[PDB]
């Protein structure tokens, strides 16, 4: 479920705070043409939270941060979180919070109060240009499990008539004195099993059908 | 003058409002938008906005378009100077002409002169046919300069559209090639000639798409979802790399500690020698903040290559991967790792290697394909390196593979080993079957001899007794030791013999 | 003293009368006989005749044989100094031990110090198992020195028996590998493991015999009938080659005349555009005395590479071959030519190229195999060269292939063209198909436009009018022109930019 | 082919019979005769005989003469290597254009690369007006190379007619 109300606002504020810390650190790289103390940081930001745009402004106060939304609402943000740690524990607007943080390309994945969301922080122009990008569909797998390496079947776990989720271990194929676990890349039921424990397979051979 | 402002406003429209709208409808950015997203705000200085072509054949004189199909100039990325060019698909399909090529040559020469990186963005169709041989000349002059810049400044290419014909050989001589999924492709000869000559029917996606070039062909170093993601990742990559072959790696303030211990690593190697583990976990625990930029992640997955940071300085990583093909060395993996090691040595980046290797891949396919030379490539790369080299053996190291993976014998500076390391000529079974060839008639003597061979030689202590290993360390100390060694080794100075160049095998 | 002559006579026997007679029964010479045939009479000085191994495991302390399985030393070939080593198959199967490796290292070091060539003769079985990891260490020290010597002194390898396992990676890093038919073979992993792992049954000849490595794998530069033929051909090769990367090519007194014309060359090119001809004929008519030493003859026969002499000085030759795949460039040919060009440039040998190329080879097999980088290897090699380059276009030069084949744009010094040359972006049919895409329906207009395009553009004169060709010459003048140009270009001075090394694709 | 020797003979005439006889009437040799006198017998190798200009202004596209007004190449003097160029007064008054300048630049570069002397023979009237600023560019590229060669290879100049402006 995607967040709502104060939860979503707290998540967006934490996202902005993380982005600000990282930009500050980034701007200290060696080898620059002139001193960075003479450059400016843009105050207006767009937090995108699994398709829910928040226009915000970020301002440092004391040693902590202040994030202002369009409603005039304000949220101060304070924490001692550092990159690498898996938990952001701090204060957002007179409420202590703990949030699970994971990384992803150009942003983070955040979990809080049973809600989960991808989070990306842009400038206005970056957001305008990102809104020109399409939403692409996934093709999906092809109804059957094919052996990607030649080897010997060591163990088949699932049974016929068995619905499966992703990451489900299905079989083990040993080759060159090393086990290899095969997993489900889709969801569905096991119709029939074509391979027996102890068999020997070639590349692109069929093990089971969905 | 208002009129000059109008001249500029008209140059900025390329080949028309309709063509730009069609580009947008395909889900693709324009040349100038790409330049805008790559560089720091307000830093872009453009060269040669008003350049026009001078061809008079086949009616070309009636359509002169300012810029001639490429946008060129310079700016800053995170404060550091970079040069760049971007091809405009809306002008004669981004095809290269004489003046177009002259613009590219201008920025290439300036970048070599200033000793700064150069980024090329490709969305093109090759040599403009209406101009004939002159067009080809242009390509040549670009190629030459690519070759002059190799090992002096980093050269990055981004494929965001079609790239066909002579256009493909310029990215091929650069250091890294990145692609966008579902809108880009590369090939030398296109589907029509393929149909007429080979009778095979094939789409462009099938012939030269992102999947082909990231998983099967060895050409592309990675792929991305769309243009915005890709340009943001190029910005990320530029912050790891040296500006040139003199200045050394950039430095940043790290949020991590160098004296921290990692207890979990003490349980990463399984008791059963038949069960694998994920070497990527080790790498992502050793680097600062868990941040790792992987190179050729979808190709030859039996080996891992990429960039991380230690104490805020860039470090390259090579590692065997047991999860795929039992971590063996084959031709593909060897070539992958060899190019990476050569780049890092050329630009003075230190290298850390993690070793778990049982041997090479057997079969007629490998031998007929040229494994002798392909394998020799990696050995050559390591033996030639003068940067610091730190190697850590986790579990297996047998035979020639042990020598190839940054051993002390080929020039490594420091060589550690975990307690689970097994450094030997080969496995106990085969060693016994060879040494005791005229005794295999029995079954119990066989087991006894195999057990005693295991006890004596399948360990790290013979190599330690000979000094091939500097220390056997506990796993939890890995990071702490690496960070210390690298520090000490920053002052290494060594040089190879004098020569025009080596004769590394191809 | 008699005792010392007795100990010498006893060290010369190696592993015993019986094993030596059995070697003779296989049709093979001994190590010392090989040395005796290679070197000038009376010239051999041997090192380290009495060396012995120091292992005490598996009873080895009871079989101590002086020399430890390899003969090492120095001598002269046609009066010029050379260093050499020869493995002895009778002693522990020619296997490499610690002291064995130290013997090879002594002569490698000496060859680098003296700046003289080194020849290695291989009849062996790899790392000696009983000595364990120590043996591996040995191999490493050899490998490193190979890499240090690359591009400083020429290194030649002769495979006159088995060569398996680690033994293969040393010859792979040398400049030339030659093999003897039906008694030699090379492979990383042997047939037994191949059976255990892939279930396929193959003989040693089928896995790594001379046919495989001279026609399929890209490993070997040539094969010979027997040992005597091979060694005499090595003596022939050495006379062409420089002694190091400073002294330049050797000179001999020629019996030919540099001012002779050849009228028959005015009829070599057929009138029918679809009929081929033999470029080897041209090469063999242009060199002194018709004498030409070909390299990689049996592999990628759509291109020719080899050594000849002009005015008594060595010259390298690269040529397209219309007889095979219409002379197109593919990946195999590009690799074959790139290695040769790089070797020539390293040791200051000038290069002459003969061009007749319609393009690259189309298809999924080529693109999936990585043509984009393989074809770039050759472009990189020519663009990087600082030696004299002379190019002659005979019939066709289309597209990017024209650029790659030593064009003026990539750095050629002199560029000539015969009267039958066609220098163009592509053939007329496709050119007008593309340009006149909105009029393809008709059939008279198309033929008229094709004829007009052929008349205007498929000639050497547009390239001549732009200065891309320095002169259009008569075929019968070819030799006379080449010899003159080379004479003038001997004083050429040029340098690449300063760098540790390039980052050529691999 | 015979057509090729015909093309050669037609390039050796420059601006025509009448202009050549006028040059002789003034007591002046031709550019090619001057080359023949300077170099050893049978040693001259010519570069870029068929080069043409690419201007389309002021009716210039109707008069394209092979060589573009300069003869360039190399040879020997008393057995020693030399490079040279000679301007032809019968072709636009030996005026300098883009391709003209490119030919001269080629021989300058070669002379520096092989470390041999270079001789320039001058009979000319400067930058070709019809070509505009492009012509000036040519002059520039020549100037720079002179400076690069100073103190490295000897450079000799012979003025055998007019030599004005640039
Ligand atoms: C680059 C290419 C793959 C792009 O394919 P595409 O996206 O389907 O689009 P198009 O080919 O129709 O190209 C866009 C325009 O650029 C022009 N263009 C493309 N490549 C060109 C080239 N090398 N020279 C000149 N013009 C070129 C095309 O004529 C076309 O013009 P139009 O819209 O005005 O009619 C393809 O055109 C191509 O392969 N070009 C190379 C030249 C060639 O050999 N083409 C023949 C086979 S397509
Ligand atoms: C080199 C080789 C290809 C030659 O095979 P071959 O001509 O059929 O002959 P053999 O194997 O009988 O070898 C000749 C001798 O050298 C010995 N030898 C060969 N390679 C050796 C090595 N690496 N270490 C120690 N001794 C070795 C053999 O044991 C044999 O001695 P023997 O006559 O005393 O029994 C093969 O021996 C080999 O592959 N050696 C590598 C080691 C190995 O893995 N052997 C097992 C596969 S057979
Ligand atoms: C070189 C020069 C001194 C020769 O004087 P001259 O022998 O009396 O002869 P001309 O001036 O008649 O020149 C010979 C031809 O070369 C042409 N020519 C000379 N210099 C030229 C130039 N720079 N650009 C183009 N054409 C030129 C003239 O047009 C004339 O052509 P034409 O005889 O077919 O009509 C003179 O032409 C000159 O000064 N040119 C330099 C450019 C200039 O500023 N000239 C202004 C008019 S003098
Ligand atoms: C047991 O089955 C022995 C065969 C497997 C040996 C493995 S296969 C890949 C490695 N390379 C090699 O030669 N030996 C190792
Ligand atoms: C006419 O039939 C043209 C088709 C064949 C063209 C040949 S195939 C190999 C060369 N490469 C290329 O692109 N065209 C040439």
PDB file of N, CA and C and ligand atoms in Angstrom, chain D residues 19 89 92-93 95 124-130 162 164, ligand 3:
ATOM      1  N   UNK D  19      48.963  31.809 -72.426  1.00  0.00           N
ATOM      2  CA  UNK D  19      49.546  32.373 -71.215  1.00  0.00           C
ATOM      3  C   UNK D  19      50.978  31.887 -71.024  1.00  0.00           C
ATOM      4  N   UNK D  89      51.855  31.138 -62.375  1.00  0.00           N
ATOM      5  CA  UNK D  89      51.267  32.460 -62.564  1.00  0.00           C
ATOM      6  C   UNK D  89      50.127  32.465 -63.577  1.00  0.00           C
ATOM      7  N   UNK D  92      44.874  31.834 -62.232  1.00  0.00           N
ATOM      8  CA  UNK D  92      44.351  32.854 -61.323  1.00  0.00           C
ATOM      9  C   UNK D  92      45.469  33.731 -60.772  1.00  0.00           C
ATOM     10  N   UNK D  93      46.498  33.962 -61.583  1.00  0.00           N
ATOM     11  CA  UNK D  93      47.625  34.762 -61.147  1.00  0.00           C
ATOM     12  C   UNK D  93      48.410  34.134 -60.020  1.00  0.00           C
ATOM     13  N   UNK D  95      47.325  32.849 -57.500  1.00  0.00           N
ATOM     14  CA  UNK D  95      46.706  33.241 -56.242  1.00  0.00           C
ATOM     15  C   UNK D  95      46.412  32.027 -55.369  1.00  0.00           C
ATOM     16  N   UNK D 124      53.275  35.073 -57.965  1.00  0.00           N
ATOM     17  CA  UNK D 124      51.913  35.035 -57.433  1.00  0.00           C
ATOM     18  C   UNK D 124      51.457  36.416 -56.977  1.00  0.00           C
ATOM     19  N   UNK D 125      50.148  36.518 -56.717  1.00  0.00           N
ATOM     20  CA  UNK D 125      49.509  37.769 -56.362  1.00  0.00           C
ATOM     21  C   UNK D 125      48.671  37.738 -55.095  1.00  0.00           C
ATOM     22  N   UNK D 126      48.840  36.717 -54.257  1.00  0.00           N
ATOM     23  CA  UNK D 126      48.217  36.717 -52.945  1.00  0.00           C
ATOM     24  C   UNK D 126      46.925  35.929 -52.823  1.00  0.00           C
ATOM     25  N   UNK D 127      46.052  36.359 -51.911  1.00  0.00           N
ATOM     26  CA  UNK D 127      44.816  35.641 -51.625  1.00  0.00           C
ATOM     27  C   UNK D 127      43.796  35.838 -52.741  1.00  0.00           C
ATOM     28  N   UNK D 128      43.239  34.728 -53.222  1.00  0.00           N
ATOM     29  CA  UNK D 128      42.245  34.756 -54.290  1.00  0.00           C
ATOM     30  C   UNK D 128      40.969  35.427 -53.790  1.00  0.00           C
ATOM     31  N   UNK D 129      40.632  36.576 -54.380  1.00  0.00           N
ATOM     32  CA  UNK D 129      39.576  37.420 -53.824  1.00  0.00           C
ATOM     33  C   UNK D 129      38.234  36.695 -53.842  1.00  0.00           C
ATOM     34  N   UNK D 130      37.916  36.028 -54.954  1.00  0.00           N
ATOM     35  CA  UNK D 130      36.618  35.381 -55.110  1.00  0.00           C
ATOM     36  C   UNK D 130      36.304  34.390 -53.996  1.00  0.00           C
ATOM     37  N   UNK D 162      56.104  38.481 -59.370  1.00  0.00           N
ATOM     38  CA  UNK D 162      55.421  39.262 -58.336  1.00  0.00           C
ATOM     39  C   UNK D 162      55.166  38.449 -57.079  1.00  0.00           C
ATOM     40  N   UNK D 164      52.873  39.793 -53.763  1.00  0.00           N
ATOM     41  CA  UNK D 164      52.236  40.902 -53.009  1.00  0.00           C
ATOM     42  C   UNK D 164      51.230  40.436 -51.944  1.00  0.00           C
TER      43      UNK D 164
HETATM   44  C1  LIG E   3      49.789  40.293 -58.845  1.00  0.00           C
HETATM   45  C2  LIG E   3      49.672  41.627 -59.596  1.00  0.00           C
HETATM   46  C3  LIG E   3      50.706  42.554 -58.968  1.00  0.00           C
HETATM   47  C4  LIG E   3      50.075  41.318 -61.039  1.00  0.00           C
HETATM   48  O1  LIG E   3      50.029  42.455 -61.915  1.00  0.00           O
HETATM   49  P1  LIG E   3      49.998  42.202 -63.443  1.00  0.00           P
HETATM   50  O2  LIG E   3      50.900  41.153 -63.866  1.00  0.00           O
HETATM   51  O3  LIG E   3      50.105  43.517 -64.012  1.00  0.00           O
HETATM   52  O4  LIG E   3      48.656  41.482 -63.768  1.00  0.00           O
HETATM   53  P2  LIG E   3      47.164  41.434 -63.384  1.00  0.00           P
HETATM   54  O5  LIG E   3      47.010  42.360 -62.256  1.00  0.00           O
HETATM   55  O6  LIG E   3      46.489  41.795 -64.614  1.00  0.00           O
HETATM   56  O7  LIG E   3      47.016  39.901 -62.979  1.00  0.00           O
HETATM   57  C5  LIG E   3      47.043  38.707 -63.805  1.00  0.00           C
HETATM   58  C6  LIG E   3      45.750  37.954 -63.636  1.00  0.00           C
HETATM   59  O8  LIG E   3      45.658  37.354 -62.317  1.00  0.00           O
HETATM   60  C7  LIG E   3      44.507  37.762 -61.651  1.00  0.00           C
HETATM   61  N1  LIG E   3      44.763  37.926 -60.293  1.00  0.00           N
HETATM   62  C8  LIG E   3      45.841  38.559 -59.793  1.00  0.00           C
HETATM   63  N2  LIG E   3      45.825  38.574 -58.502  1.00  0.00           N
HETATM   64  C9  LIG E   3      44.641  37.978 -58.131  1.00  0.00           C
HETATM   65  C10 LIG E   3      44.078  37.725 -56.874  1.00  0.00           C
HETATM   66  N3  LIG E   3      44.667  38.058 -55.740  1.00  0.00           N
HETATM   67  N4  LIG E   3      42.880  37.107 -56.843  1.00  0.00           N
HETATM   68  C11 LIG E   3      42.314  36.739 -57.995  1.00  0.00           C
HETATM   69  N5  LIG E   3      42.775  36.934 -59.238  1.00  0.00           N
HETATM   70  C12 LIG E   3      43.969  37.557 -59.242  1.00  0.00           C
HETATM   71  C13 LIG E   3      44.074  39.038 -62.353  1.00  0.00           C
HETATM   72  O9  LIG E   3      42.682  39.102 -62.267  1.00  0.00           O
HETATM   73  C14 LIG E   3      44.496  38.799 -63.791  1.00  0.00           C
HETATM   74  O10 LIG E   3      43.538  38.015 -64.504  1.00  0.00           O
HETATM   75  P3  LIG E   3      43.211  38.300 -66.046  1.00  0.00           P
HETATM   76  O11 LIG E   3      44.474  38.647 -66.581  1.00  0.00           O
HETATM   77  O12 LIG E   3      42.688  37.095 -66.570  1.00  0.00           O
HETATM   78  O13 LIG E   3      42.271  39.385 -66.142  1.00  0.00           O
HETATM   79  C15 LIG E   3      48.263  42.217 -59.344  1.00  0.00           C
HETATM   80  O14 LIG E   3      47.350  41.538 -60.115  1.00  0.00           O
HETATM   81  C16 LIG E   3      47.812  42.407 -57.906  1.00  0.00           C
HETATM   82  O15 LIG E   3      48.259  43.355 -57.333  1.00  0.00           O
HETATM   83  N6  LIG E   3      47.068  41.487 -57.293  1.00  0.00           N
HETATM   84  C17 LIG E   3      46.943  41.449 -55.841  1.00  0.00           C
HETATM   85  C18 LIG E   3      45.518  41.610 -55.351  1.00  0.00           C
HETATM   86  C19 LIG E   3      45.031  43.032 -55.418  1.00  0.00           C
HETATM   87  O16 LIG E   3      44.886  43.692 -54.406  1.00  0.00           O
HETATM   88  N7  LIG E   3      44.853  43.533 -56.618  1.00  0.00           N
HETATM   89  C20 LIG E   3      44.194  44.786 -56.871  1.00  0.00           C
HETATM   90  C21 LIG E   3      44.330  45.228 -58.287  1.00  0.00           C
HETATM   91  S1  LIG E   3      46.065  45.529 -58.723  1.00  0.00           S
END
